[PDB]
Structures are given as structure tokens and as C-alpha cells.
Amino acid sequence: ADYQGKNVVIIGLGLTGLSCVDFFLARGVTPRVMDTRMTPPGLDKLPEAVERHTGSLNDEWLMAADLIVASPGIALAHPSLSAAADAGIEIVGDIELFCREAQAPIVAITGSNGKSTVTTLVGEMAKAAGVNVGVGGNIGLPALMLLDDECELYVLELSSFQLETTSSLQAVAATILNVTEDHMDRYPFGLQQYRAAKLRIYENAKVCVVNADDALTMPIRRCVSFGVNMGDYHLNHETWLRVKGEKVLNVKEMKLSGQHNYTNALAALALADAAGLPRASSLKALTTFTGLPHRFEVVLEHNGVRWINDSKATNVGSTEAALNGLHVDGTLHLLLGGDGKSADFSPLARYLNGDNVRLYCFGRDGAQLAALRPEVAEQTETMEQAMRLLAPRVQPGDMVLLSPACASLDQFKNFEQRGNEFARLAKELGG
Ligand SMILES: CC(=O)N[C@H]1[C@@H](OP(=O)(O)OP(=O)(O)OC[C@H]2O[C@@H](n3ccc(=O)[nH]c3=O)[C@H](O)[C@@H]2O)O[C@H](CO)[C@@H](O)[C@@H]1O[C@H](C)C(=O)N[C@@H](C)C(=O)O
Ligand SMILES: CC(=O)Nc1ccc(Sc2ccc3nnc(N)n3n2)cc1
Ligand SMILES: CC(=O)Nc1ccc(Sc2ccc3nnc(N)n3n2)cc1
Ligand SMILES: [Cl-]
Numbered sequence: 001a002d003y004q005g006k007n008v009v010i011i012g013l014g015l016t017g018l019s020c021v022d023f024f025l026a027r028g029v030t031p032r033v034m035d036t037r038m039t040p041p042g043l044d045k046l047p048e049a050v051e052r053h054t055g056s057l058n059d060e061w062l063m064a065a066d067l068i069v070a071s072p073g074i075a076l077a078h079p080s081l082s083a084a085a086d087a088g089i090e091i092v093g094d095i096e097l098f099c100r101e102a103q104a105p106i107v108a109i110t111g112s113n114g115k116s117t118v119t120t121l122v123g124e125m126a127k128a129a130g131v132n133v134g135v136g137g138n139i140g141l142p143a144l145m146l147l148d149d150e151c152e153l154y155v156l157e158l159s160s161f162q163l164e165t166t167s168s169l170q171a172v173a174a175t176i177l178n179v180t181e182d183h184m185d186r187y188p189f190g191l192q193q194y195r196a197a198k199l200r201i202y203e204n205a206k207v208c209v210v211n212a213d214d215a216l217t218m219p220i221r222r223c224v225s226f227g228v229n230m231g232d233y234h235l236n237h238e239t240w241l242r243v244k245g246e247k248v249l250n251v252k253e254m255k256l257s258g259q260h261n262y263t264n265a266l267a268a269l270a271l272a273d274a275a276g277l278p279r280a281s282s283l284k285a286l287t288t289f290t291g292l293p294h295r296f297e298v299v300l301e302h303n304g305v306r307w308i309n310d311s312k313a314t315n316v317g318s319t320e321a322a323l324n325g326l327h328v329d330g331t332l333h334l335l336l337g338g339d340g341k342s343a344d345f346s347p348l349a350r351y352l353n354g355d356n357v358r359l360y361c362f363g364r365d366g367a368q369l370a371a372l373r374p375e376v377a378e379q380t381e382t383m384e385q386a387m388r389l390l391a392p393r394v395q396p397g398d399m400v401l402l403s404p405a406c407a408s409l410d411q412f413k414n415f416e417q418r419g420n421e422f423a424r425l426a427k428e429l430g431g
Contacts, residue, residue: 001100003029009061011081012071013040013052016094019142020069021050023097034058036074041413057081065089069097072138072161075186093165095158098143100168104134106154107271108169108205110198111177111217113318114264115139116292117256118177119157121268124289126153128281138162153275160197161186173274174201175209175267179216180317184342191216207274209267224274226266228259233266235259241266241286248279253287258296260321294419296322296403300426304396307426310403311419316347319405323351330356330397333390335383335422336369337362338406345405348372358393360386364410382411383418384425391429400426 003024008031010020017033024031025047033046034053046052053061057080062068068084068091076082076091085091099106109119116139126133134146137156146154158166160183176198179191187193195216202208202219211217212227212234226233236242239262241249248269251262265286272282291297292312300307313319319336326332334352336345336359345365349372352359359377361369362385370377380386383402394400408418 001097003027003067006066007064008032008067008069009034009065010069010071011035011057011074013037013042013046013054014071014073015042015140015142016071016073018042018045019144020071020094020097021046023094023144025050031069032061034061036078059083062089063087067092069093070165072159072165076164077188091165092167093162094142094144095137095156095162095166096168098147098156099166099170101147102151102154103149104151104153105172105275106156106169107275108156108158108171108174108201109177109267109271110158110160110163110201111175112180112182112315113321114177114260114267115157116312117261117264117295118175118268118271119155120292121265121285121289122155122271122275124285125268125272125277125282126155126275128285128288129277130281131277153277158201160194163200164197166200169201170204171201171206172276173207173209173271174205175271176201176211176217177264177267178211178214178317180315180320181343182315182317182341186341207271209270209274211263211267213263224270226263226270228263231266233270235262235266241269243269243273249283249286255287255290258321258325294416297419299423300430302431304398305394305430306399307423307430308399308401308403309419309422309426310401311408311415311422313403313405314407314415315341316343316345316405319348319403320351322401322403323348326351326399328356328397328399330395330399331358331393332356333358333360333394333398333400335360335362335386335390335400335402336372336404336406337366337383337386338364338404338408338412338418339410340365340368340406343405345369345372348405352376358390360390362386363404363406365406369405383422387422387425387429394430400430 123135208223212231225231
């Protein structure tokens with residue numbers, strides 16, 4: 001791709017938009033940037049020579065563009081962006097720009113839950129083999145910052161939003177880990193529209209890796225599969241990872257636990273195998289990886305109480321993965337809240353029966369979450385209020401679990417800030 005002389009407009013003054021500004025400037029193109037937010041987080045990090053427009057989309061700029069670069073946070077269905085598409089103005093995202101420049105194979109990972117774990121695992125498998133690997137995308141390091149002529153393999157976590165604006169991805173190995181309701185505020189044609197965006201990841205992929213236990217991960221119309229009791233990669237119950245009936249790893253050697261993390265390990269191994277990484281070093285990486293911050297992270301274990309930061313549980317399916325099979329000796333104090341993105345929370349209710357569960361519900365959708373079981377629920381405005389309410393009630397044997405089933409953007413800079421604030425309060429209140 002050659003952008004010289006083009007009128008380039010970037011939508012979004014967040015992490016993605018700033019990475020795109022740097023990308024174009026380094027290639028001799030001065031873009032313009034807009035964002036519907038009046039004071040977006042990148043407003044003061046923008047180079048002084050770059051024109052900026054905030055508080056709305058600027059149709060004068062969009063309709064004059066040769067190329068529109070849309071951050072994943074702007075809907076293609078926004079009327080101004082849809083009008084530009086109607087006029088035949090090219091619209092891409094940062095992942096598209098990346099794919100046009102990358103010169104190493106790409107492993108591409110999407111799904112409603114498990115993405116960052118699988119992405120990081122494949123990266124660790126590559127590192128264990130001595131491969132120069134770049135890991136990024138939706139996990140938090142903008143993909144354009146990975147571009148490096150010495151890179152031998154890229155591992156990208158991709159969201160449905162990023163996939164909507166991507167056309168040139170030809171992954172060496174691609175997966176949809178699972179499909180459960182999320183981002184319904186962005187998908188007015190519902191679950192199948194969200195699924196269709198994720199299904200784009202398989203187009204022109206050399207190997208597709210599907211979840212044998214989740215039919216929505218399969219192309220609508222020759223894929224490798226992983227699953228619990230079936231699949232090319234599957235579990236054998238002590239629990240083993242197996243490939244086509246052959247034991248490859250006793251999961252006692254992993255640091256992660258839980259069935260969903262064992263299938264994450266299977267998916268990572270299937271992708272690593274498809275990318276040509278040596279099996280021995282891939283298996284080694286499964287035994288060294290300890291987990292990610294904010295993903296079912298024990299931030300304090302003291303006086304018989306475990307305080308668990310699962311702030312990365314931004315949808316119902318992720319909270320379900322925390323709750324399904326969860327063992328608690330005493331009472332579970334569960335923190336739910338934030339921006340639910342129009343999700344139906346009712347699938348959580350089957351985990352919330354019995355005498356040993358208390359709900360502390362906060363943020364934009366706190367009332368809807370407390371309605372799951374009002375007789376054991378309290379509602380506050382903020383997470384801090386919820387923590388100060390529950391802490392006097394905690395007894396040895398209890399668990400305090402932040403697994404909020406919602407996005408954090410109504411009250412926090414990012415889910416990391418939500419998790420960090422939870423950890424600070426847990427240390428104050430629990431020690
Ligand atoms: C919403 C989203 O896709 N966020 C990803 C994005 O971060 P970035 O800061 O660039 O986001 P953005 O595109 O500026 O959008 C951020 C927020 O601003 C809003 N926004 C954005 C542009 C605009 O004109 N108006 C507006 O209101 C968006 O709706 C959203 O609420 O790019 C980063 C690098 O690729 C990702 O790590 C990050 O994943 C975050 C963690 C996320 O929540 N992703 C979603 C998809 C998920 O995991 O479910
Ligand atoms: C249908 C099919 O066979 N798809 C495919 C996808 C990826 C690869 S690996 C690779 C290596 C360098 C490179 N540079 N750009 C890109 N997309 N790649 N991909 C092989 C085949
Ligand atoms: C079996 C099934 O459910 N297939 C399906 C596939 C895609 C969609 S998404 C869609 C559908 C219509 C439409 N009209 N305008 C827009 N933007 N859309 N989007 C939904 C269902
Ligand atoms: Cl968030």
C-alpha cells in the first residue's frame with residue numbers, strides 16, 4: 001500500500017487513533033483526526049501539526065477523504081461514516097493497515113472469552129522456540145506498533161469491531177474461541193450479526209481452528225477442532241491435553257486451572273502447531289505461563305479470604321466461566337456492574353442460588369444486575385461503595401470476586417483501572 005499524497009482522515013483519538021497518526025506521519029502523510037467525544041483521552045498527546053476535530057464527526061472532512069481510518073470504537077453504521085461508505089470512500093481500520101505492511105505470518109485470535117489468554121500463550125510458545133514474535137492487537141498494544149522487519153511471527157488478538165474493517169488478513173492460523181452475547185449496543189441485528197463479524201477471521205486463513213463444543217465458531221459453509229470430549233485437540237479425564245488420542249500434557253504441570261483454561265491451552269497448541277512451532281517448546285510454554293492481571297487474579301489471600309480481581313470479565317460468558325464450578329467454603333461476595341452493553345444477564349441467575357451468595361451491584365446497570373436475585377442483592381452507585389459495604393460482612397472462608405459482566409467505561413478509564421482500584425481497596429479492607 002502507498003498512501004503518499006492522499007487525504008487521510010482518522011476517526012478516534014484513543015490508543016488506536018494515536019498509533020495511526022504516528023504510522024502515517026512516519027510514511028510522509030499528515031492525517032486529520034476526529035472523535036465524537038468532546039475531550040477524548042488522546043486529545044493532549046496529539047502532535048501539534050495534526051488538525052483535530054472533537055465533539056462530533058466532521059462530514060466536510062469525511063466526504064473529502066481519500067481514505068478513512070476508523071478506530072474500532074466507532075460504528076460503521078454511524079450515519080456520517082455510512083454516508084461516506086455510500087459514496088465509495090475507502091474505510092479501513094488499523095488492523096487492515098497492519099496486514100498490508102506485515103511481512104511475517106499472522107496467528108489471529110478472536111472470541112467472546114479467552115482471547116488474551118490464548119494470544120499470550122501462543123506468544124510464549126513462540127518465545128520458547130526462539131522465534132522473534134510480536135504480540136498485540138485488542139490485547140492492548142496497538143498492532144501497528146509491532147511492525148518490525150525482523151519479526152518472524154505476529155500473534156494478534158482481534159475483536160469483532162476490528163474484523164469489520166479488515167479485508168486483507170490471510171492468517172496462517174485463525175480461531176474463534178467461542179461466541180456468546182456481547183457488544184449488542186453495536187449489533188442491532190443481534191447475535192448473528194456479531195458472529196458474522198467474527199467469522200471474517202477465517203477468510204483466506206491457511207488453517208481454521210474451531211471449537212467443537214460451540215457451533216457458532218464454525219464457518220457458515222476442513223477446520224481443525226478443539227473441545228472437551230471431542231475434537232482433534234481434546235481433554236482426557238486428573239486431566240490431560242490430547243491430540244488425536246495421544247496424551248501431550250498432564251494439566252497438573254500448568255499454572256492455569258479450570259476447564260475453560262484447558263481448552264484455551266488446546267486452542268493455543270492447535271494454532272502453534274499450524275504456525276509450525278515445535279511441539280516441545282510449545283508444551284513447555286504451557287507450563288510456565290502464570291496468567292494475566294485482571295483475569296481471575298488473586299490480589300489478596302489473607303485471614304482465610306480470597307479477593308479475586310476478574311475485571312476482565314466484561315460480558316456474561318466471562319463471568320459464567322468464573323462462576324461455573326467455583327468452589328467457595330463460605331460466602332461468595334460477588335461484585336457486578338458497569339455498562340452491560342444491552343446484554344441479557346439472566347444466564348447468570350442459575351449460579352446464584354443457595355444461602356452462600358451475596359450480590360453487590362453498581363454502575364450504570366446496577367439495578368438490572370440486582371434484579372437477578374433481589375433478596376441477596378445490594379445496589380450502590382460505585383464499586384468503592386460496594387466494597388466498603390461488603391467488607392464488614394466478610395468472614396474467613398469467604399471469597400470476594402470482582403467479575404462484573406460489564407464494560408467499565410461508564411466509570412473508569414479502562415478495565416485495568418477498575419481492577420487496580422479493586423486491588424487497592426481489597427488491600428485496605430482485607431488486611
Ligand atoms: C472499544 C475498543 O475496541 N477498544 C480497543 C481499542 O482501544 P482505543 O482506545 O483505540 O478505542 P477507541 O476506538 O478509541 O474507542 C474507545 C471508546 O471511545 C468511544 N468512541 C470512539 C471514537 C469516537 O469517535 N467516539 C466514541 O465515542 C468508543 O465507542 C469506545 O467507547 O484499541 C485497542 C488496541 O487495539 C484495544 O486494546 C481496545 O480494546 C479494549 C480493551 C476493548 O474494550 N475492546 C473490546 C472490543 C473488547 O475487548 O470487548
Ligand atoms: C488460503 C491460504 O493458504 N492462506 C494462507 C494464509 C497465511 C499463510 S502464511 C503467510 C506468510 C507470509 C505472509 N505475508 N502476508 C501474509 N498474509 N502471509 N502469510 C499461508 C497461506
Ligand atoms: C441464519 C442467520 O441468522 N443469518 C444472519 C446473518 C447475518 C445477520 S446480520 C444482518 C442481517 C440483515 C441486515 N440488514 N442490514 C443489516 N446491516 N443487516 N445485518 C443476521 C442473520
Ligand atoms: Cl472496558
